[PDB]
Design a protein around this ligand. Structure first.
Ligand SMILES: Cc1ccc([C@@H](CC(=O)N(C)O)CP(=O)(O)O)cc1
Ligand SMILES: Cc1ccc([C@@H](CC(=O)N(C)O)CP(=O)(O)O)cc1
Ligand SMILES: [Mn+2]
Ligand SMILES: [Mn+2]
Lengths: 410, 410
């Protein structure tokens, strides 16, 4: 019986997690939902709570804390531990009654619970790629300290890559650990992408796209922020850096491939040149589930892939000209240092502006490119808490600088 | 270092095996070729011996054994143990200095070599599916007795499927053994086929196709017999049974899929419904190579898969009306008992007649169908030696029944 906590339980990853968990539990009782944690969604949490009845509830924003107790009151034969903020978050990570933590809080704020999940040597099922991109080297140092903690990727491409690996080797290492790719005989990664809605647009058509265009006909069901990143392929860029960090794969050996059917989720090339890939319908339930069952698999009632019906699969290289965010991610990644933290922060800002109709598509890459330009390598703090503050310092600087470039521009 | 013997070393899989070994040793000296064994190619063996300098040489035809000794005298700083016929074979199989045997021989002689390799607890890289199809029962019994013996599949679809498995699990069990499927969480198999050259033909065009038609559009570099089997899709049929036996997958759960680009070489659907696949250019070098390095992988100079250039992959179900051998194979296999030995032996005859323009395309399946129809289940021998005799008796009976049906035609 696997004891599980969900951070960001009402988010797209959270709901998907609870769903596959509920379906797998009907087949055979395998998961116990021990803890749910949301940012500010108290009605939604209350309804998850009545259904899954975990031991811990945790709302972050402490204003609506007393209100949550008000709703959960009205659930009979049930009284869970109710917490707030990072004190709840921490109490939860340290509970011995919990083994795996799904991190479905999905921006730089998710770093804290990831950090605390690792510090308590848990299995961390991680869907927050921003934290690996911003804090990769930090997480790597923290993992070297917490020897029994494990990051299991949930981001679907990285889960794919991870599922293409021989657990006989994986178990000799772990994600975010130097030498991972050598021990797994990995030569190269095909990092597949839906391409987003703008793949077939000309340069001129591209210049004009809006957030409304970007949000139309989602190939996956997801939040607004990553939908914009998919549109610019900043999502893929970030995932290039995430790949580098999770699997210690050089940037020369990560190739982005546009696969519009969303069936092959990514592929691994091994040192003999054999390639192994993972396929399924575009559904987040598989990668979430595998992160909770690894190194095993369990039965689901999910619809089986019908390859004949799907019939065709296609692959092409994205144009860096049309998708310059991809180039910027590689550049920042290759330069290393805190350039990735800057990439991610400036993008939080450019992303949201474009989503809110404040700038144009190419303004997104221009702003980001200028903030990267204006940053100078810093000496990397040896001390772990110094490194944290440094990362926050640079992240907050990068956001402010991006906002400044937008504000000074007509 | 990997200590390998090659049986049938001047043959197709033989020379392929030595080619990938030669290329891999140039990168990093990895394989020690311990024994070469040929039927009666004196000069070729001498030439391979000069290159790989194995400790054992063996030629089957005793008439050339003295000639061979004269030849190898001219290789400097070389004094191998030179043998002949089945005795040399068995002696090689008994050497503690040999870990893996590539079986590159067909017909009984190859089954005999397989048996002796297994009786000696070796790893057997088996590139001859007819023995699994026909003698599946016997091999399975044998592998139960010799617990440390392993069969590793070389047939490329089966290699692919094997490459798609988690060796953490594979190592708890082995191929051709009850429970392999349960232990590896395997739910279903996509068994990919090139489709051969007749996929788009109508029933009426099919009626009149010739062996000359069949031997066009060679997508892999292959011998005549398997090329005809590819055209009829009897190859895939046999391989369906091969899959049943190697991986303990029910026939209901093996789906033949026509994939004309020959990049995805087969796929495994696990019980969560996640699917894992192996891709590469159509080449027989990876599968041979993986059979020799499993559970590891080693570096090659093979041309990397360029997915963007490959660009498109296609999948459709084959029409059973057009390729009836497929149906016969499932029928024979599902019926079990010695029906697959009969299927295989009748096809041997049917295939060769069509190759030589003695019968038409639908006659192949017709002859085979009749032989299956005329065969009566026999109680299966408990005794390993009696079982082998049954298999041979039935195989000889079926060849003769098929010839007889052809003879009495018109
Ligand atoms: C609408 C939309 C479409 C697609 C995405 C992403 C989703 C993702 O990152 N997964 C599933 O792991 C895929 P991509 O960056 O290749 O376009 C997000 C939103
Ligand atoms: C010309 C030709 C083309 C293809 C084959 C076979 C080869 C095979 O079975 N491999 C390589 O494992 C593939 P299929 O039966 O799917 O057509 C044989 C001959
Ligand atoms: Mn992703
Ligand atoms: Mn094959």
């Amino acid at each position: 019986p696997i004891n599980v906590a969900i951070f960001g339980s009402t988010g797209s990853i959270g709901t998907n997690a609870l769903n596959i968990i509920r379906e797998c539990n009907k087949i055979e009782n395998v998961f116990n939902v021990k803890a749910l944690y949301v940012n500010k969604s108290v009605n939604e949490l209350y309804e998850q709570a009545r259904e899954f009845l975990p031991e811990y509830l945790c709302i972050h924003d402490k204003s609506v804390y007393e209100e949550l107790k008000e709703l959960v009151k009205n659930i009979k034969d049930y009284k869970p531990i109710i917490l707030c903020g990072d004190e709840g978050m921490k109490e939860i990570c340290s509970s011995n009654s919990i083994d795996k933590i799904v991190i479905g809080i999905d921006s730089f704020q998710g770093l804290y619970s990831t950090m605390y999940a690792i510090m308590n040597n848990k299995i961390v099922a991680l869907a927050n790629k921003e934290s690996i991109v911003s804090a990769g080297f930090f997480l790597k140092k923290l993992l070297n300290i917490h020897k029994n903690a494990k990051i299991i990727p949930v981001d679907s491409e990285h889960s794919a890559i991870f599922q293409c690996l021989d657990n006989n080797k994986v178990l000799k290492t772990k994600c975010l650990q130097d030498n991972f790719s050598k021990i797994n005989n990995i030569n190269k990664i095909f990092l597949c992408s839906s391409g987003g809605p703008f793949q077939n647009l000309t340069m001129d058509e591209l210049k004009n796209v809006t957030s409304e265009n970007a949000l139309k006909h989602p190939k996956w069901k997801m939040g607004k922020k990553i939908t914009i990143d998919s549109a610019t392929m900043m999502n893929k860029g970030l995932e290039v850096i995430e790949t580098h960090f999770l699997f210690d794969v050089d940037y020369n050996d990560i190739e982005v491939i546009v696969h519009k059917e969303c069936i092959i989720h990514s592929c691994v090339e091994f040192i003999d040149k054999s390639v192994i890939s993972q396929m399924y319908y575009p559904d987040m339930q598989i990668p979430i589930l595998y992160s909770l069952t690894w190194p095993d698999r369990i039965k689901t009632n999910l619809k089986p892939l019908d390859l004949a019906q799907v019939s065709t699969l296609t692959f092409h290289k994205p144009s860096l000209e049309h998708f310059p965010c991809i180039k910027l991610a590689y550049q920042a990644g290759i330069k290393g240092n805190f350039y990735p933290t800057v990439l991610n922060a400036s993008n939080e800002i450019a992303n949201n502006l474009f989503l809110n109709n404040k700038i144009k598509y190419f303004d997104i890459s221009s702003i980001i490119s200028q903030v990267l330009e204006s940053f100078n390598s810093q000496k990397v703090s040896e001390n772990s808490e110094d490194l944290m503050k440094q990362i926050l310092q640079i992240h907050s600087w990068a956001k402010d600088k991006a906002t400044d470039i937008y504000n000074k521009h007509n």
